[PDB]
């Protein structure tokens, strides 16, 4: 069981597009997630990978695979801090009762994507990390189960 952050490109130059992708594997019972992706605003700017629209405070992660089934009522939210380089995205079903009794666990899959148009040639860091939004976290990740209790003991993998 782990949450991973994958970048499809590691070392490139200015004006290029880096798709960061938040992913979960074997997160059994997961009914909801909150992640924090910390970046440097001076070196990198947050954008939508499909159209190229910049990220504001209310902007969600692109193209969720997990926690998106309308049967179980997804409640998506984002309170990002672009000024201080934080993506704060939360997603969380309401109808847990049905989700657990269906006999399907949303364990492995994509949480969401975020584009990153590069501004400077100097090298920087991109990772899942604690903020003011996520106290009592595992490397800037909170995860609940279909009973509402916080899941603990999964690993959080960063990119290179």
Residue numbers in the entry: 4 to 163
Provide text from the study.
In addition, cellulosomes are central elements for the production of readily available sugars in the gastrointestinal tract of a variety of mammals. It is now well established that a wide array of highly ordered protein-protein interactions involving dockerin and cohesin modules (defined herein as Doc and Coh, respectively) mediate both cellulosome assembly and cellulosome cell-surface attachment. Primary scaffoldins, in addition to containing multiple type-I Cohs, have a divergent type-II Doc that binds to type-II Cohs located in cell-surface anchoring scaffoldins, providing a mechanism to tether the cellulosome to the bacterial cell envelope. In addition to ScaA, inspection of C. thermocellum genome revealed the presence of an ORF (Cthe_1806) encoding a protein comprising 2177 amino acids and containing a putative type-II Doc, which was termed CipB. Type-II Docs of primary scaffoldins ScaA and CipB in C. thermocellum possess two distinct Coh-binding surfaces that recognize different Coh partners.
